[PDB]
Enzyme design. Structure first.
Site, PDB file in Angstrom:
ATOM      1  N   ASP A  54     -11.421  21.630   8.103  1.00 39.39           N
ATOM      2  CA  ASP A  54     -10.925  20.281   8.379  1.00 39.39           C
ATOM      3  C   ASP A  54      -9.824  20.218   9.440  1.00 39.39           C
ATOM      4  O   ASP A  54      -8.718  19.761   9.171  1.00 39.39           O
ATOM      5  CB  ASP A  54     -10.445  19.618   7.077  1.00 39.39           C
ATOM      6  CG  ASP A  54     -11.581  19.368   6.097  1.00 39.39           C
ATOM      7  OD1 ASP A  54     -12.746  19.359   6.556  1.00 39.39           O
ATOM      8  OD2 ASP A  54     -11.314  19.181   4.884  1.00 39.39           O
ATOM      9  N   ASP A  61     -19.641  23.882   0.809  1.00 40.08           N
ATOM     10  CA  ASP A  61     -18.277  23.431   1.050  1.00 40.08           C
ATOM     11  C   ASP A  61     -17.312  23.882  -0.051  1.00 40.08           C
ATOM     12  O   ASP A  61     -17.738  24.270  -1.153  1.00 40.08           O
ATOM     13  CB  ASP A  61     -18.259  21.910   1.144  1.00 40.08           C
ATOM     14  CG  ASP A  61     -17.130  21.392   1.995  1.00 40.08           C
ATOM     15  OD1 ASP A  61     -16.263  22.197   2.421  1.00 40.08           O
ATOM     16  OD2 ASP A  61     -17.117  20.170   2.231  1.00 40.08           O
ATOM     17  N   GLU A  77     -12.976  27.958  -0.929  1.00 40.53           N
ATOM     18  CA  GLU A  77     -11.728  28.726  -0.898  1.00 40.53           C
ATOM     19  C   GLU A  77     -11.401  29.443  -2.224  1.00 40.53           C
ATOM     20  O   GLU A  77     -11.131  30.645  -2.222  1.00 40.53           O
ATOM     21  CB  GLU A  77     -10.545  27.857  -0.451  1.00 40.53           C
ATOM     22  CG  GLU A  77     -10.560  27.487   1.024  1.00 40.53           C
ATOM     23  CD  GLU A  77     -11.677  26.523   1.369  1.00 40.53           C
ATOM     24  OE1 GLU A  77     -12.164  25.837   0.427  1.00 40.53           O
ATOM     25  OE2 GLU A  77     -12.059  26.453   2.577  1.00 40.53           O
TER      26      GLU A  77
HETATM   27  C1  LIG Z   1     -16.015  19.633   2.851  1.00 41.94           C
HETATM   28  O1  LIG Z   1     -15.977  18.264   2.403  1.00 41.94           O
HETATM   29  C2  LIG Z   1     -17.016  17.424   2.946  1.00 41.94           C
HETATM   30  F1  LIG Z   1     -18.176  17.583   2.216  1.00 41.94           F
HETATM   31  C3  LIG Z   1     -17.298  17.782   4.412  1.00 41.94           C
HETATM   32  O2  LIG Z   1     -17.643  16.630   5.179  1.00 41.94           O
HETATM   33  C4  LIG Z   1     -16.092  18.431   5.074  1.00 41.94           C
HETATM   34  O3  LIG Z   1     -16.407  18.616   6.458  1.00 41.94           O
HETATM   35  C5  LIG Z   1     -15.795  19.754   4.368  1.00 41.94           C
HETATM   36  O4  LIG Z   1     -14.456  20.195   4.643  1.00 41.94           O
END
Ligand SMILES: *[C@@H]1O[C@H](F)[C@@H](O)[C@H](O)[C@H]1O
Ligand SMILES: [Cl-]
Ligand SMILES: [Cl-]
Ligand SMILES: [Cl-]
Ligand SMILES: [Cl-]
Ligand code: NI
Length: 944
Positions: free
Chosen positions: A615, A538, A541
Site C-alpha cells: 500500500d 493479500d 504479513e
Molecule cells: C490488500 O487489501 C486489498 F484487498 C487490496 O486492494 C490492497 O491492494 C491490498 O493491500
C-alpha cells in the site's frame, strides 16, 4: 586448550573448550555453499527445521579436511573455510586464496528482550559480526522503503510490514553473499531498535529552556494549547481504534475531524560524535526541518504510516534547530533515532535477531552476482516458472463491484486495441457478513463461472483476492477452529475490522501443513471450481489488526505451530503460499499456478508467487523509493516483484472534488488534473520496466482510458509503453524463462553487471532490466530531463534515437513527459515480436533481432507453451544468438530443444544499429534482412 574436532559426513563439528558457544558445526551444502552453526549447547537438535532452506547437506560434493596447529581447513573446489581451534572463528577464502569474509568474534548471545510472550529457556538474542573496517558494498536484504541500494555503513531493520518484506540474503561487492536463517525480526548494522528521540539526545524547547520539545496544538490556524513534551508519541492504537496515547482533551475533537494540526519545536544535542540515524514514523502531512533546512517532506495515508529515515553527521555538545509540522488527518506519529555505534563497528558487517536457539547462516561463494543468487535459489528453492501471461499487462482496481464492471473494463481495453492479459477481482465480493466463507454475493456476482468464462473468452486470465481472514460466524472459520488452527486473541481483544459497524475477525495459522491443507480445500471447493486463474493472497504479513504495536502483533500469533509470534515474525507468507501452491499441484499436475502476495521471506519464489510492495502512496518520493525496493528484492534472490502503478492511495485532493467521488479523471478538480496525469504517465513508464507490469489502487480509476482521453499526449504515452511491453515479450519472457532455468534475476542493481565500478554501486534511481536495458525512471514532478550515469567500460545507445554514447560519464538525459530515459548496452541482442494484445497471440511469432553493435553479443531466446508444467520435463526451446563485432556477424545458432505446439519454421529478420536512426523503435517497418529459419544455424553479415 584447543577445540576438539569431529569429522562428519557433511563437514566438521568443533567442541570449543571455552566461552558461551559450545559447538561450531560446518556443513558442506554444495560446491559453493557452507552452512555455519554456532551453538550454545551440545544438542543441535534444538534448532528448528528451516522455513527458508529446503536444501539438505550435499552427499556428492568432494571436500577435504586438513588440520594443523590451531587452524582447521575445510574446502571444496570453490570455497575454503579456515576455523580457529582457539576461539572457533571462521575465515572464508575463494578458490584462489583471498579473504572474502572473516568473523570477528564467536558471536554475541544475549537475553531475548522483544518477545511479549513467555520465552523458551534456550532461546537468545543473536548477533554476529564480520569484516570490521571493510570498504565493501552490501546489497539485497529484501524490499525496503528508504532508498538504500548499497546498505554498507547504514541500518536496515528486517521486519515484516505492508510496505516491507525482509529476505535475509545479503550480497557483497566481493564474491560472496550469505543467508541468515532466522525467522524472527532481524537487524543489519546497529543491533538496537531505533529509540525515542530523547534517549541519546538532550532536548530543548522553543523557550531554549532544557526539558522536552515545544508541542503546539492547533485547530485550524487557531492555537489551542502549548506545552513541552519529552517523547511526543502517538504511534499506535492499543485496541480497536483507540490511540495508545490519547490526544489532549481540548483538541481531541480536531484529530477525529481532520482540522487538527501540530507543530514541534526545539533543539537537539547529541552527547556523542559520528553518524546518527533518524526515523520520522507518520501518516498525514509531515514535514521535518533541521538547521533551518527541510530534510523530510512526506505524506502517507492515515491507516498505513511508516518510517522516513536520514543519516547526518553530529558533533557532541552541538545544539541544532529542529522544526516539525504534522497535519495528522487521523494518522499516527512517533520520532525515533539512534546514536553512532562504537567507532570500531562504524564500518563492519553485523546481523542480529530477536530470538533464536543458535547463530545459523550459509556462506555462498560466487564469481558473479548471478552466481551468488544461484546459491540462494539452491538453498531456498528454484524460482518456479510463472505462466507467460503473468509477464503481460495486469489491470486491477480497489475495487470492481460486479461481474459486469469487470467484463466492461476488460472489453474497453480490447475495443481500444490496447494490450492486456490479466484483470483482477479484489476484496468484498462475498456476502458482507461472511468474510472467509468464500461465497459470491448473488447481487453483484450471481454466476462466478460465467464471469470467468467471459474473461477467458476474451483471452484474458482473472485473479481473485483471498485473505487468511475469517469471521467466526462462518463455517470455514468453525472448521479450521475445531482443529485448533485459528489465531483467536484478536477476537478476545474485540478488534472489529472496517467493514460496516465493524466485524469480529481472526486469521488462521499456516505454520502447520494440516492447517494449510484445509485452507486450500476451502478455497478449492469454493473458488477454484469456477476456474479462476490465480490467487491474490493479500494481508499475509499478517495484518490481523492494522496499527497495533508490533509486540501486540507478535502476541496475536501466539501460540502458532512453531512457538511465539516473535519467533516466526517474518515467515508467515511462505508456508501460507506453499499450501496454495501444493494444493494446485495436487489439483492440476500440468498447469502453472500463479500467486501474487504482499509479503515474503526466503523461499517465497518456490511457491510460484510474485510479491508487491503493498500500500504505497501516490507520491513522487514513493515512486522513487520503489526503485531501491525492487532492486533490493531482486538482489535478495527474489526477482518476480511489482508495485501498484500510480500508488495504492492518492491524497484526498485526488479522490474527491467539487464533482464528488472521482472515478474518471474528468471528475477531478481542474487544478489537480495535470499532476494526476503526469504522475501516472511517469509511473506507467517505470511500471513497464519492472518484472511484473501492473496497474492497481484506490480511486480514481486506474485504466489508461480513465487516467486521460484518447488522443492526448499522456494517453498515447501510456498506450505506447504498454505496446512496447508486448513488442518486447520475446525478450521479457526469455528473462522469465531464465528465472528458473538459469537462476536468473530480472531487475538488476548496477553492481550485478558493473561490479568493478564503485560509482555504480551506490546508485538508487537507475537499474538494468535484463542484460540490455538501462532504465532511468523520472521521479520528479515537471522534470523534463534527469541526470543519468552511464556505467564504465561499455558503450550505450539511446533506445529512441540511436545516438551512441560512451560510458564512464554522467549525462543530462532528455526526458520529455512522453519518454523515460532508456539506454541499450553496446553488444545487446534484443529480440522483438509483432504487436500482440495478449501473450498467446505471440507464440511462434515472427521475430525482429536487433543487434546493438560496438561489442560482442549473446542472447538465447527462450520459448515454451507458457502455461503447462511440461517445461519441467524438457519441453522448451532456445534459439541461440551470437554476435561477433570484429567480423560483424550475427549467428542464429541451431535450435536447442522442442515443445508441443512449437513451430519448426520461423520468420526472422535481423537489423544492426550503430548510431542515430529514425527507425530506432519502428519495429514493423525497419529495414532488416529476412531469413527463413528452420532450426538450422544461419549467419547474417552486418551491412557495409
Ligand atoms: C490488500 O487489501 C486489498 F484487498 C487490496 O486492494 C490492497 O491492494 C491490498 O493491500
Ligand atoms: Cl484471440
Ligand atoms: Cl483478442
Ligand atoms: Cl487479439
Ligand atoms: Cl488474436
Ligand atoms: Ni487475441
Amino acid at each position: 586448550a584447543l577445540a576438539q574436532v569431529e569429522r562428519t559426513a557433511e563437514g566438521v563439528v568443533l567442541t570449543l573448550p571455552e566461552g558461551t558457544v559450545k559447538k561450531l558445526r560446518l556443513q558442506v551444502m554444495g560446491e559453493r555453499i557452507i552452512r555455519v552453526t554456532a551453538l550454545p549447547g551440545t544438542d543441535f537438535g534444538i534448532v528448528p527445521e528451516s522455513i527458508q532452506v529446503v536444501a539438505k547437506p550435499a552427499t556428492n560434493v568432494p571436500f577435504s579436511v586438513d588440520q594443523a596447529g590451531e587452524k582447521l581447513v575445510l574446502k571444496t573446489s570453490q570455497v575454503s573455510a579456515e576455523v580457529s581451534l582457539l576461539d572457533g572463528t571462521v575465515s572464508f577464502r575463494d578458490a584462489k586464496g583471498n579473504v572474502l569474509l572473516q568473523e570477528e568474534n564467536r558471536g554475541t548471545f544475549s537475553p531475548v528482550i522483544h518477545d511479549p510472550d513467555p520465552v523458551d529457556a534456550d532461546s537468545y538474542a543473536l548477533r554476529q559480526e564480520f569484516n570490521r573496517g571493510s570498504d565493501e558494498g552490501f546489497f539485497g536484504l529484501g524490499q525496503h522503503q528508504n532508498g538504500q541500494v548499497n546498505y554498507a555503513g547504514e541500518n536496515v531493520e528486517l521486519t515484516t510490514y505492508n510496505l516491507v518484506i525482509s529476505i535475509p540474503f545479503l550480497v557483497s561487492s566481493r564474491n560472496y553473499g550469505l543467508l541468515w536463517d532466522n525467522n524472527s525480526i532481524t537487524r543489519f548494522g546497529d543491533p538496537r531498535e531505533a529509540q525515542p528521540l530523547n534517549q541519546s539526545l538532550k532536548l530543548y524547547d522553543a523557550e531554549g529552556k532544557e526539558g522536552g520539545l515545544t508541542v503546539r496544538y492547533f485547530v485550524g490556524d487557531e492555537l489551542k494549547l502549548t506545552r513541552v513534551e519529552a517523547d511526543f508519541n502517538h504511534q499506535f492504537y492499543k485496541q480497536g481504534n483507540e490511540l495508545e496515547n490519547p490526544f489532549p482533551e481540548e483538541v481531541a475533537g480536531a484529530y477525529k475531524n481532520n482540522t487538527l494540526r501540530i507543530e514541534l519545536e526545539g533543539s537537539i544535542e547529541a552527547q556523542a560524535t559520528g553518524k546518527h540515524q533518524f526515523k520520522m514514523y507518520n501518516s498525514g502531512y509531515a514535514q521535518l526541518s533541521l538547521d533551518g533546512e527541510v530534510v523530510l517532506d512526506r505524506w502517507r495515508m492515515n491507516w498505513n504510516p511508516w518510517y522516513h529515515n536520514f543519516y547526518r553527521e553530529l558533533n557532541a555538545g552541538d545544539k541544532h534547530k529542529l522544526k516539525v509540522s504534522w497535519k495528522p488527518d487521523g494518522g499516527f506519529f512517533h520520532l525515533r533515532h539512534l546514536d553512532p555505534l562504537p567507532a570500531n563497528e562504524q564500518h563492519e558487517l553485523s546481523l542480529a535477531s530477536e530470538t533464536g536457539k543458535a547463530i545459523d547462516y550459509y556462506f555462498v561463494a560466487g564469481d558473479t552476482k548471478d552466481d551468488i543468487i544461484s546459491g540462494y535459489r539452491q538453498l531456498t528453492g528454484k524460482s518456479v516458472m510463472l505462466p507467460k501471461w503473468a509477464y503481460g499487462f495486469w489491470q486491477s482496481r480497489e475495487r470492481y463491484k460486479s461481474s459486469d464492471e469487470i467484463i466492461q473494463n476488460l472489453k474497453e481495453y480490447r475495443d481500444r486495441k490496447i494490450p492486456i492479459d490479466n484483470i483482477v477481482l479484489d476484496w468484498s465480493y462475498w456476502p458482507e457478513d461472511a468474510w472467509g466463507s468464500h461465497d459470491f454475493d448473488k447481487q453483484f456476482f450471481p454466476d462466478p463461472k460465467a464471469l470467468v468464462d467471459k474473461v477467458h473468452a476474451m483471452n484474458a486470465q482473472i485473479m481473485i483476492s483471498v485473505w487468511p481472514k475469517f469471521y467466526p460466524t462462518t463455517d470455514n472459520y468453525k472448521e479450521l477452529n475445531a482443529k485448533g488452527f485459528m489465531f483467536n486473541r484478536n477476537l478476545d481483544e474485540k478488534n472489529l475490522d472496517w467493514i460496516g459497524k465493524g466485524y469480529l475477525n481472526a486469521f488462521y495459522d499456516p505454520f502447520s501443513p494440516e492447517a494449510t491443507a484445509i485452507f486450500w480445500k476451502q478455497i478449492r471447493d469454493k473458488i477454484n471450481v469456477h476456474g479462476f486463474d490465480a490467487w491474490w493472497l493479500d494481508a499475509v504479513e499478517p495484518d490481523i489488526h492494522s496499527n497495533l504495536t508490533f509486540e501486540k502483533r507478535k502476541w496475536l500469533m501466539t501460540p502458532n505451530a512453531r512457538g511465539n509470534g516473535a519467533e516466526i515474525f517474518n515467515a508467515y507468507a511462505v508456508p501460507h503460499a506453499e499450501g496454495v501452491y501444493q494444493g494446485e499441484l495436487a489439483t492440476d499436475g500440468d498447469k502453472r499456478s500463479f500467486i501474487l502476495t504482499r509479503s515474503g521471506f526466503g523461499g517465497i519464489q518456490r511457491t510460484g508467487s510474485a510479491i508487491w510492495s503493498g500500500d504505497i502512496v501516490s507520491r513522487w518520493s514513493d515512486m522513487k523509493d520503489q526503485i531501491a525496493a525492487g532492486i533490493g528484492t531482486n538482489l535478495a534472490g527474489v526477482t518476480n516483484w511489482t508495485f501498484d502503478i500510480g500508488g495504492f492511495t492518492p491524497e484526498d485532493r485526488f479522490r474527491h472534488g467539487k464533482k464528488g467521488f472521482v472515478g474518471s479523471w474528468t471528475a477531478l478538480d481542474a487544478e489537480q488534473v495535470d499532476e494526476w496525469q503526469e504522475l501516472n504517465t511517469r509511473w506507467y513508464q517505470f511500471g513497464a520496466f519492472v518484472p511484473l507490469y501492473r496497474s492497481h489502487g484506490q480511486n480514481p480509476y486506474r485504466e489508461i482510458f480513465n487516467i486521460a482521453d484518447e488522443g492526448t499526449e499522456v494517453y498515447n504515452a501510456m498506450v505506447w509503453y504498454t505496446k512496447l511491453r508486448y513488442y518486447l515479450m520475446p525478450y521479457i519472457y526469455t528473462l522469465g524463462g531464465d528465472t528458473y532455468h538459469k537462476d536468473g534475476t530480472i531487475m538488476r542493481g548496477l553492481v550485478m553487471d558493473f561490479p568493478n565500478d564503485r560509482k555504480a554501486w551506490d546508485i538508487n534511481t537507475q537499474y538494468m532490466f535484463g542484460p540490455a536495458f538501462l532504465v532511468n525512471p523520472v521521479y520528479e514532478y515537471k522534470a523534463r530531463s534527469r541526470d543519468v550515469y552511464l556505467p564504465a567500460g561499455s558503450d550505450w545507445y539511446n533506445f529512441y534515437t540511436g545516438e551512441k554514447l560512451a560510458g564512464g560519464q554522467t549525462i543530462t538525459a532528455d526526458a520529455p513527459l512522453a519518454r523515460v530515459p532508456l539506454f541499450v548496452k553496446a553488444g545487446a541482442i534484443v529480440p522483438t515480436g509483432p504487436l500482440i494484445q495478449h501473450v498467446d497471440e505471440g507464440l511462434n511469432s515472427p521475430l525482429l533481432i536487433t543487434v546493438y553493435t560496438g561489442a560482442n553479443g549473446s542472447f538465447d531466446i527462450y520459448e515454451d507453451d507458457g502455461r503447462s508444467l511440461k517445461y519441467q520435463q524438457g519441453e522448451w526451446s532456445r534459439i541461440p544468438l551470437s554476435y561477433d563485432d570484429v567480423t560483424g556477424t550475427l549467428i542464429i545458432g541451431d535450435r536447442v530443444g522442442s515443445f508441443t505446439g512449437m513451430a519448426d519454421e520461423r520468420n526472422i529478420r535481423v537489423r544492426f544499429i550503430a548510431g542515430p536512426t529514425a527507425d530506432a523503435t519502428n519495429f514493423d517497418k525497419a529495414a532488416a534482412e529476412a531469413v527463413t529459419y528452420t532450426g538450422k544455424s544461419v549467419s547474417i553479415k552486418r551491412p557495409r
